[PDB]
Design a protein around this nucleic acid. Structure first.
Lengths: 817, 98
DNA sequence: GATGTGTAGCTACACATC
DNA sequence: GATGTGTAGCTACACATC
């Protein structure tokens, strides 16, 4: 036998048994190094390389997950690493080997890479996949390489990153993730943003360098459209950072991250974020709940309420460890003050009886601690930081005080004095004004009482300024007008009885409300309307006399003013309904509807569209509004391309429209009647959008008429009714709609649009329980177009299918009784 | 009014949780045993290294970039709760579905 | 594009072993 | 305690095939 032939027999023997299982791979590595060592002494070095390569080539055409290929891949990867290991630890302390070991390794790896690369651009997916796969698992162990071979690697990879297959695109990053130390990063930052394969982004996400420069793009995936890709940044990336989040992340992004995960739509992402906070971050800070709160900027963050609760549920044991001795109330900080709020409200909601008895001071005693901070804030002189610190503490304690057990008469009267003297303060910031009224509300146990006290705080603040104006002009300064109304709003937000019961408001109204409505300042005008809207919900006649002025404010008012005005009108209708329109001395509803249109149509102010959108849906749900033309104007604003840019408006309709139809048959019926003309108007819009040639063209800013059609089949489908009386199986709501669509089919011009409809007409639901005459009508219109028009073979088939389903249905009817 | 309004309200939240995006997302949404390393068929080897020819093995430049970055749009959490509450008087709520 | 089927990445519980 | 082990199921997501 020949030396060369003997080598092949030896190496081929290795792969034959290595493909069978992972059993004797340790041996095979030792054998291969032996075969190589035997060949180099006989001079046949290049013979070993040749047969090794040719034997690896046998597995490239194998699919992904083909169990055999993986085995060999792992074997080839182990053999290279094994050859480098011997080289590394040797270079460590052992003097250089006389047997030219590095050279053999350098020459073998270079030669091998160039071989596997010969199929880097093969027409076959599997070939290209397994070429990159081999390079990925062997990339770390290559060591030194020639420059030309280095340039050829980055080149072949930079072109494969944009390969057609995702599978091969993945492996393309792995090979790049190694060239990352700081062009490689540049590419991965581009793939993590623009690659349409979630798994290629994920690969570029987890394996990116995580440098100060690349950290933003990585965290960006927190809102990746893929469920997994979002769960990972919490479970994988933030864990890997441990405590580095609090040091090497800007808090403004930090707060945003925790806000998303907690409020995400997928249960799997919330937990993954919850578990990060409770388990990982608490163990990372040695169980110091305060330090954890020091990180989560408690003063500014709006999620501390969400984060803490998930923790209390994840660790009910630490719950009992809290500490609140009388000795403190000296070092009270935003963290401790907030802790007090977080704990106390949590015990009440979950009803932790043992704690509420002694873990919290009495009402009378809490008032002593609360007031203490009020005097220290307002009565006597990093100053602004201190001022904020006190306000936050005052707020937290106040929130806890709002839900106390006030059976204790001494504590109530004590607290009541603290808030009354606080609310009476002129420089009390709005956050504390709000809760103050909320507290004083919980102390009255009598609506009239709560009002009498509040009104007094207002009129006193009013008269104080007026009486000070007596120098040498019988009205309070502008600033005072703001304070009185700010308090009047929250106080009114809590009253739930007519104005006839409480006369003090009618005075207050003529005192400062209506003079504010007529004021020359925006903010005061906005406030006056808010308070006016709160009073209208109590007395109907007050609303009827104010319908005109309100509608006027909307029409001619600026963005801000028109914003608040339109809301009031919605609520007035919510409670009273149509008792405030269409009648003697009452405004005609037609005028208001025209005012809804102009806002809904208005695109210069998006936020106002949302209210007009949200507000009208609510009114249609309440069955107070019943105007087909208006309801039709709603759905148009959903699909319209002009409103596509208003992200808020789309989600508003996407949730209200489906529920509206499925709620009540009469609601769905209203869709069915006006569901045909809408499709027509939209077809025309898509036709004018696609055909028109303009620089500002976003032809993709609208659903194609085929999708829009399916949508209208969805809502009109009676099977989606929630009541399901059992007598709804015969509901002809969807048929009558399709009939109306067929009657319009003659009015569309483009063939493409016509097909877009016909291909989707069979989504309807047909039943033998439905009305016989209605199916016959639907058959004749389908029969009318089945032949009298020219059809694409696809359109005819679907249409013919429908007809025969009709005919097959009439067969199920008549033959009866 | 809360009794049954509560459940129907709870019905639509859980059912329409993933359709919040609206728009196109309205749709509910939703071998070889062994190799013989001894045989020689090396002309098969030339098959592997074949040039691309008319096979594309690449991604259209249209698909290589996307402006949305495949991110998720801002979420306004339009749930049954946000609908029942009034606008200027969030505490009180109206009893639609009645 | 509509399918059916496979796959990735969990997620949970019962457990041992030290 | 923690650390493994095995087993089970789940769901959004790929690819397969026509």
């Amino acid at each position: 036998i020949d030396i060369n032939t003997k080598i092949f027999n030896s190496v081929a023997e290795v792969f034959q048994k290595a493909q069978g299982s992972y059993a004797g791979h340790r041996k095979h590595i030792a054998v291969l190094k032996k075969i190589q060592s035997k060949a180099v002494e006989q001079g046949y070095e290049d013979a070993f390389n040749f047969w090794f390569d040719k034997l690896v080539t046998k597995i490239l055409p194998l699919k992904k997950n083909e169990i055999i290929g993986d085995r060999i891949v792992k074997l080839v990867a182990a053999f290279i690493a094994s050859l480098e290991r011997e080289l590394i630890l040797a270079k460590k302390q052992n003097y250089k080997l006389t047997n030219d070991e590095e050279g053999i390794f350098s020459r073998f790896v270079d030669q091998f890479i160039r071989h596997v690369l010969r199929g880097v651009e093969s027409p076959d997916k599997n070939v290209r996949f397994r070429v990159l796969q081999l390079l990925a698992v062997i990339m770390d162990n290559i060591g030194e390489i020639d420059e030309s071979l280095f340039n050829l690697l980055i080149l072949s990879l930079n072109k494969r990153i944009y390969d057609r297959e995702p599978t091969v695109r993945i492996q393309a990053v792995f090979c790049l993730t190694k060239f990352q130390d700081e062009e490689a990063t540049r590419t991965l930052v581009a793939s993590i943003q623009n690659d349409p394969s979630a798994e290629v982004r994920r690969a570029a996400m987890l394996n990116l360098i995580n440098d100060n420069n690349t950290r933003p793009y990585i965290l960006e995936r927190a809102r990746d459209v893929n469920i997994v890709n979002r769960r990972l940044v919490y479970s994988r990336i933030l864990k890997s950072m441990g405590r580095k989040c609090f040091d090497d992340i800007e808090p403004h992004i930090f707060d945003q991250l925790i806000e998303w995960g907690l409020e995400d739509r997928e249960l799997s992402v919330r937990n993954a974020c919850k578990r990060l906070i409770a388990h990982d971050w608490l163990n990372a800070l040695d169980g110091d709940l305060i330090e954890l709160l020091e990180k989560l900027d408690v003063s500014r963050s709006s999620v501390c309420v969400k984060a803490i609760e998930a923790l209390f549920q994840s660790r009910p044991d630490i719950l009992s460890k809290i500490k609140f001795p009388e000795s403190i109330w000296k070092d009270f900080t935003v963290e401790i003050a907030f802790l007090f709020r977080a704990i106390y409200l949590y015990c009440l909601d979950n009803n932790i009886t043992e704690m509420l008895e002694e873990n919290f001071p009495e009402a009378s005693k809490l008032s002593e601690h609360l007031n203490h901070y009020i005097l220290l804030r307002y009565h006597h002189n990093q100053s602004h930081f201190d001022y904020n610190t006190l306000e936050f503490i005052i707020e937290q304690l106040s929130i806890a005080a709002e839900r106390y057990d006030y059976s204790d008469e001494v504590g109530r009267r004590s607290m009541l004095t603290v808030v009354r003297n606080m609310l009476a303060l002129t420089t009390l910031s709005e956050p504390l004004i709000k809760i103050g009224i909320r507290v004083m509300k919980s102390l009255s146990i009598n609506e009239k009482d709560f009002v009498t006290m509040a009104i007094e705080i207002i009129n006193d603040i009013r008269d104080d300024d007026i009486e000070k104006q007596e120098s040498e002009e019988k009205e309070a300064s502008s600033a005072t007008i703001v304070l009185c109304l700010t308090r009047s709003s929250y106080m009114l937000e809590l009253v739930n009885t007519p104005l006839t019961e409480n006369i003090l408001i009618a005075s207050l109204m003529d005192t400062l409300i209506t003079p504010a409505v007529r004021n020359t300042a925006p903010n005061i005008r906005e406030l006056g309307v808010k308070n006016l809207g709160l009073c209208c919900l109590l007395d109907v006649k007050l609303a009827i006399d104010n319908m005109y002025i309100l509608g006027m404010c909307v029409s001619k008012g600026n963005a801000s003013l028109k914003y608040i005005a339109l809301q009031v009108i919605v609520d007035i209708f919510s409670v009273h309904g149509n008792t405030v329109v269409d009648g003697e001395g009452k405004v005609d509803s037609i005028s208001l509807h025209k005012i809804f249109y102009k806002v809904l149509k208005n695109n210069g102010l998006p936020e106002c569209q949302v209210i007009a959108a949200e507000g009208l849906c609510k009114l249609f749900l309440a069955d107070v509004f019943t105007d087909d033309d208006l309801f039709e104007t709603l759905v148009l604003s959903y699909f319209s391309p002009i409103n596509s840019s208003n992200e808020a408006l789309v989600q508003a309709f996407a949730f209200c429209i489906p529920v509206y139809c499925f709620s009540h048959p009469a609601h769905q019926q209203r869709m069915s009647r006006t569901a045909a003309d809408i499709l027509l108007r939209l077809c025309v819009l898509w036709d004018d959008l696609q055909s028109s040639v303009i620089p500002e063209v976003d032809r993709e800013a609208m659903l194609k008429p085929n999708i829009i059609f399916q949508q209208l089949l969805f809502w009109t489908d009676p099977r989606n009714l929630v009541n399901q009386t059992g007598s709804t199986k015969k509901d002809t709501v969807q048929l009558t709609f399709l009939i109306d669509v067929l009657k319009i089919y003659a009015q569309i011009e483009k063939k493409e649009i016509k097909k877009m409809i016909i291909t989707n007409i069979n989504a309807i639901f047909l039943s033998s329980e439905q009305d016989y005459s209605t199916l016959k009508e639907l058959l004749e219109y389908s029969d009318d177009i089945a032949e009298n028009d020219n059809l694409d073979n696809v359109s005819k088939n679907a249409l013919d299918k429908l007809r025969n389903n009709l005919n097959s249905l009439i067969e199920e009817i008549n033959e009866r009784s | 009014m809360s009794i049954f309004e509560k459940d129907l309200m709870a019905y639509f939240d859980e059912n329409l949780n993933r359709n919040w995006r609206g728009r196109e997302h309205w749709k509910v949404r939703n071998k070889v045993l062994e190799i013989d390393f001894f045989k020689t068929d090396d002309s098969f080897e030339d098959k592997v290294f074949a040039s691309k020819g008319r096979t594309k093995i690449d991604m259209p430049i249209k698909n290589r970039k996307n402006d949305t970055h495949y991110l998720l749009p801002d979420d306004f959490h339009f749930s049954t709760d946000r609908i029942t509450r009034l606008f200027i008087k969030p505490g009180q709520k109206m009893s639609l579905f009645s």
